[PDB]
Structure formats: C-alpha cells, structure tokens
Amino acid sequence: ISPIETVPVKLKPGMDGPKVKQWPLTEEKIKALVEICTEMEKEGKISKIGPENPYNTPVFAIKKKDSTKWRKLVDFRELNKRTQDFWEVQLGIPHPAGLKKKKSVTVLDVGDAYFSVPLDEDFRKYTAFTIPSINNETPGIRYQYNVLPQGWKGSPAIFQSSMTKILEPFRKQNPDIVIYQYMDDLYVGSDLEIGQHRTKIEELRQHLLRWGLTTPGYELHPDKWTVQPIVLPEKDSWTVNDIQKLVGKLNWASQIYPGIKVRQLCKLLRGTKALTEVIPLTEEAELELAENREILKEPVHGVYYDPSKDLIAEIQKQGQGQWTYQIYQEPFKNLKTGKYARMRGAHTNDVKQLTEAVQKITTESIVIWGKTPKFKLPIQKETWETWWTEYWQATWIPEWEFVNTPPLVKLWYQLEKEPIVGAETF
C-alpha cells in the first residue's frame, strides 16, 4: 500500500454491495490463497474483517501462462456492475478503433500497479472476500481491501492519470503502435515484423518494470481473423435425404437472408421415395441453389455495432473437438462468427475446450469492441461452475448463461467455409 489520495467512490444509486456465496475450493487452492493472502496483509494491501460486514465476493486461484505458482483471482463481476460508472467527462479509457486493424497484438497483465494506490476507506466494505476451509472445520478468513483490487472496474479507472503518464514517453514516441487498456491488461500492437514487434514489447516491459510493476510462438493476429462464409454441399448426385437436409437449413437461413428460396427444391421432394433414392435436379431447382449460394457469398447487409446494446456470443459444440460461435447483439444480425478447434492435449476435457474458447472469443470482443460479450453456453450450470476455473488463465471473467442449442443453428454454422489447406508453415 502507498497512501496517496483516494477519490470518494460509491455504488450506483439504490444499489447495495455484493453478497455472493463462496465456491468451495480444493486444498491445494485454500493453501496457496492463505499464503498469498497472508503476505498482502502484512504488505498492508488487504486487512482481516469481522462478521459485521455482510458483503462477500468469490475468490478462486488459478495458474496463468507461466504460473507455476498459484495466482489469485477475485470475481468482482457483481461489484463491478454495482459500481457507479465513470463517464462524467473521462478517465474511463475510450476505444482505439485500430488495434483490430493492427498486424500483431500482445496482451500484458499490469494489474499489479493497483496496489500502490489506496482505495477509499468508505468503499472497502464492498471488497470483502473469504478464504473457506475444508470440511467446515473453521470459519473462512475474511479480508477486505485497502488498495485498488485487480479485476475491479474502478481500478484501471482511478489509475488512469498515472497509466497515461507511464505510457506517453513510449506512446508519444511510437505513434505507429497502439496500446489499449482493458481491466488489468494492456493490448499492444504494431505492424512491425515478428522480432521488431516482440523487441518493442520488451522495451515496453522495461519501461514498466523500470517504473513500478512487472509486465507478466504466441501473440494475437487481428489481421488474420476473417469472418467466414457458409458453403452449401455440392454432390454430383443428390438423394431425397440430401435434398431434405439441405432444405431444412435453407428454410432456417431465410431468417437472415430473406431471399433464400427453397420452392423449386421442395418440389423434387413430392412422392414417397426411398430416403436413399437419387433424383435429378430441375433446371429451376438447379439455379435456385445457384441463387442461394449467391445470397450466401456475403454477410447480411446492415450489421452495424451499437455500443449501447449489449454484445452477445453463442457457442455450439460441434463434436470431434470443433466448436462454433457468433457474436451479435440482435438475432440474426451477426457482428462476427467463427469456428474454434480444441487446444493441444485438451482431448478429454469438454470443459477445458469450452473455457479456452470463451477466453479466445472474449479477447476479440475486447480487441474489436473493447468490451466483453455475455456468452450462451451449451453446458449445464453445475458442470461449468464446477470446473471452469481449473483452466481459467485470464484476469477478467465474462458474463454467461446456460442454454439449449437448437439442432438447426448448429447444422447451419457448421457449414462455414474452411481453407483449401490452411494458414500453413514450411
């Protein structure tokens, strides 16, 4: 803790602070958190609290990128929501509509920088978290915060003036490079070749170690994220079933592109025939595909981002490792869509695969829009709440809801185009 001055933060009018139960953790995690928390207490950042403070916010403990020792993760989502927004004029970082267009982006956890800024004594109550005990042999260790907490929305807010000062000397120096700050991280891009990019990151890391915070192949590539097109089947010969499958998809797609027509096809479908039966295509049905393939060659006209509206993302499990998702804000009006293939090793864990995607998808939602999407997860509440942190490696947590994938949405997006080969290497 570094006792500078604290601004009198408060909650959104009418709102009360958070009272979220604590998830129970394994022994390996209670241990690490107990240790981690013990230091911070002595280092003055957080301080033990009594029972008269009725708030609470969940703590988890994870193992980030190079985390071979445990990191601490508090879930401030409910607090963040209850925390009065920050746009009287500014100090709430704007969206630099160019990191997306950028050739390469690197994420940097700089949330550490908050500890050296005190947090308004009056707000602290709402920061209460609890380390639970095994088999309920003892009460949990309740603490509070004395400094800016990593993962709180108000944190990168108050530490705005200082992050600006920290950055200009590099920013103001390299204006051909963009630095965007979302929550506890820093997104940093430039068109410089691989080495020329990584090197400048190093430099930046110096500038930050040098100043007062560690800055803890793979980098992003916003230049390569192509929003993909649906591609209909094209067998030399069709069966009653092939036409019937095709037909159900077209009739669903007509919710996006209303000019999708399925009449001249539905015609070939009259007669009680062997599902396995072959049928020649009417020259009308023939062009109808043609006209359908054409409508499908591009994203629907008119999709434009509305910053005031929530951003939504839906994933559908496609099995065999693959998944599909779509960020959008109004039904059928997709901002982005894509396909994600499980990480290496992740083969036996659907949950691993799923969290890995919520993460990668949430990255773009920040890069691109500078905010996070509420996910529609094809998973049971219990199945998720149970094992998601086991693989969480990010400082921020998105919002979510558990859903039931309509069979057709899946049948459709599965259609998306893929490369002849891919994005190869020699």
State the amino acid at position 179 in one-letter form: I
63 touches other proteins (CB under 8 A): no
Q: What distance in Å separates the CA atoms of residue 175 and residue 75, rounded to the nearest whole number? A: 35
Q: How far is the CB of 287 from other proteins (least distance, A)?
A: 19
Which positions from 164 through 223 interact with other proteins, judged by CB under 8 A? none
Among 18, 55, 143, 375, binds other proteins (CB under 8 A): 55
User: Annotation-wise, does 16 bind a ligand?
Assistant: no
Nearest to other proteins of 9, 269 (CB atom): 269
Q: What distance in Å separates the CA atoms of residue 243 and residue 97, rounded to the nearest whole number? A: 44
What residues are paired with 185 via a beta bridge? Answer: 109, 182
Q: What distance in Å separates the CA atoms of residue 58 and residue 330, rounded to the nearest whole number? A: 32
Cβ atoms within 10 Å of 198's Cβ, excluding its own: 15
387 touches other proteins (CB under 8 A): yes
Which positions from 295 through 354 interact with other proteins, judged by CB under 8 A? 316-317, 319-320, 348-351, 353-354
Place of tokens 């985390």: 67
Q: How far is the CB of 321 from other proteins (least distance, A)?
A: 8
25 touches other proteins (CB under 8 A): yes
User: Annotation-wise, does 185 bind a ligand?
Assistant: yes
For 183, the token pair is 């929550």
Q: How far is the CB of 16 from other proteins (least distance, A)?
A: 9
How many positions of this chain bind other proteins (CB under 8 A)?
Answer: 66
288 touches other proteins (CB under 8 A): no
379 touches other proteins (CB under 8 A): yes
Q: What distance in Å separates the CA atoms of residue 252 and residue 255, rounded to the nearest whole number? A: 6
Nearest to other proteins of 197, 261 (CB atom): 261
26 touches other proteins (CB under 8 A): yes
Nearest to other proteins of 53, 228 (CB atom): 53
Among 136, 161, 308, 425, binds other proteins (CB under 8 A): 136
Q: Which H or E run includes 204? A: helix 194-211
Provide the residue count of the chain. 426
130 touches other proteins (CB under 8 A): yes
Nearest to 56 by CA among 89, 31, 78: 78
Among 275, 290, 421, 423, binds other proteins (CB under 8 A): 275
Which positions from 148 through 167 interact with other proteins, judged by CB under 8 A? none
User: Annotation-wise, does 122 bind a ligand?
Assistant: no
Nearest to 317 by CA among 407, 252, 228, 397: 407
377 touches other proteins (CB under 8 A): yes
The separation between CA 99 and the C-alpha centre of its own chain, rounded to angstroms, equals 16
Mark 229-242 as b/e (b = at least 16 C-beta within 10 Å): ebeeeeeeebbbeb
Q: What distance in Å separates the CA atoms of residue 287 and residue 293, rounded to the nearest whole number? A: 9
Backbone angles phi, psi at 160, to 5 degrees: -80, -60
21 touches other proteins (CB under 8 A): yes
Three-class SS of residue 107? strand
- Interface residues with other proteins (CB under 8 A) are 21, 24-28, 30, 50-56, 128, 130, 132, 134-140, 142, 239, 241, 244-245, 247-248, 251, 262, 266-267, 269-270, 272-277, 316-317, 319-320, 348-351, 353-354, 377-380, 382-384, 386-387, 405, 407-408, 410
